[PDB]
Paper text:
Pif1 proteins are monomeric enzymes and members of helicase superfamily 1 (SF1), while the 5′–3′ polarity of unwinding place them in the SF1B subgroup. The overall organization of these domains is similar in all nucleotide bound and free structures determined. hPIF1 has three structural domains, two RecA-like domains 1A (residues 206–381, blue in Figure 1) and 2A (residues 382–435) and domain 2B (residues 436–548, green in Figure 1) with a SRC Homology 3 (SH3)-like fold, in addition to the small functional domain 1B within domain 1A (residues 280–300, cyan in Figure 1).
The structures we report are of constructs from residues 206–641 (apo hPIF1) or 206–620 (the structures with nucleotide analogues bound). In the 1.44 Å apo-hPIF1 crystal structure residues after 620 are not seen in the electron density suggesting they are disordered. SUL1 is stabilized by hydrogen bonds with the main chain atoms of the loop residues from the Walker A motif and the side chain of the Walker A K234 residue at the beginning of the α2 helix, situated at the 1A–2A inter-domain contact area. Tight packing of this area is maintained by interaction of the inter-domain linker R381 (motif IV) with the carboxyl group of Q206 at the N-terminal part of the 1A domain. A second arginine, R584 (motif VI), interacts with S557 (motif V) and the carboxyl group of I554, contributing to the rigidity of the inter-domain 2A–2B contact area. K485, N486 and N495 are in exposed loops where a sulphate ion is located in the apo-hPIF1 structure (SUL2 in Figure 1B). Residue K414 was also selected for analysis and we also included the E307Q Walker B motif variant as a control. K414 is also in the vicinity of a bound sulphate (SUL3 in Figure 1B) and is conserved between mammalian and bacterial Pif1, but it is not in the ssDNA binding channel revealed in Bs and ScPif1 structures.
Author numbering: 203 to 618
The structure:
Amino acid sequence: SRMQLSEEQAAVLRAVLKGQSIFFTGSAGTGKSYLLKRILGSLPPTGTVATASTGVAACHIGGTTLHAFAGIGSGQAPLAQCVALAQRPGVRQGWLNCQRLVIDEISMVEADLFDKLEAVARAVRQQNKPFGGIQLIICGDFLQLPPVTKGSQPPRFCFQSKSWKRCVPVTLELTKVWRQADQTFISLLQAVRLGRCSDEVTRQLQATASHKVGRDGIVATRLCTHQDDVALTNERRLQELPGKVHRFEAMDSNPELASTLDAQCPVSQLLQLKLGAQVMLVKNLSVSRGLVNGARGVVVGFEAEGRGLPQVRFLCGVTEVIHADRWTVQATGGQLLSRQQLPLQLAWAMSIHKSQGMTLDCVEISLGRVFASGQAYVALSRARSLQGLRVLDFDPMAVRCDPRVLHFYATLRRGR
């Protein structure tokens, strides 16, 4: 075990191994990802179900989406219907065989959906205990973006559900800046997350507006709010370059489901590159050499023969030819599907949604406009340090947070 756990992280692990349902929570940069991986290595594979609310986060933990596991379609039908969908052959044994259920990215789950899931559990398993007697291991942070709904009315946070207190009797916090993160920058994030933008926070961010962050042909990625505008942007920037197009097609086990893999793993069926393309790594190839998720680079060549694989120069100081990697996704019903493709994305632009669970080493962020509660904090959390970041037109009016969620955190802090 490469690194020793902190006293706060050790407490979580203890509780989990005694069989207790627990929610653990804290800002970015407190070691939540490291702790999830240590929990999943410590538990028996048999009966342990790793899930996340998103595709992006599910892949980072080698699991599946909560939507796919559940098998209740959208969750919006009456209980008896949801319950009938969960009874379907493959979907049903997943519920029966689950002993411990890990759920990352809990901020994304709306309260009415948590309540539907909890009742579906008790019915399918014929067990009167909370969530059908499953040991729940829940990770996230409600000071992130609010949950989305389609349901016409306001969305409600997961902690407002009728079954939350019954299901989650112990909550523990991670508060210290983790040993793989920068003290100065995480301390600034922790102030922004609580809505608190002092004159010194505003100075430190405004001071980055003039920063040159790239070098050696690598330029900063512009962080954006919406995935579709991002794809058009990256495609237009690639079209402007004069080099010939190089195409890389995925090898899929089940090509009749490519759309599903496009939507759940971090790479597509077809990757196009040229000399000069701005790229981002999306697998951890080597932590010790800086080849981690979010590492920024530029294409500097292609192999002259064979498959013509790209040669990438990274900001971290590595130049290397990038080969195909593998991802496995679990479909509703349980079938394992696989995609082999290069672990690279275009990176003139990147959305907040597709960058969850990672940080970039070369990034530009615009924060003069007001966004939702938690938006300024979540965007700044995609950077690593003040050195790798340029903030345009920062305004402390950009910083808003949800007062109901602040009171939830203040109660937790008063405990200890």
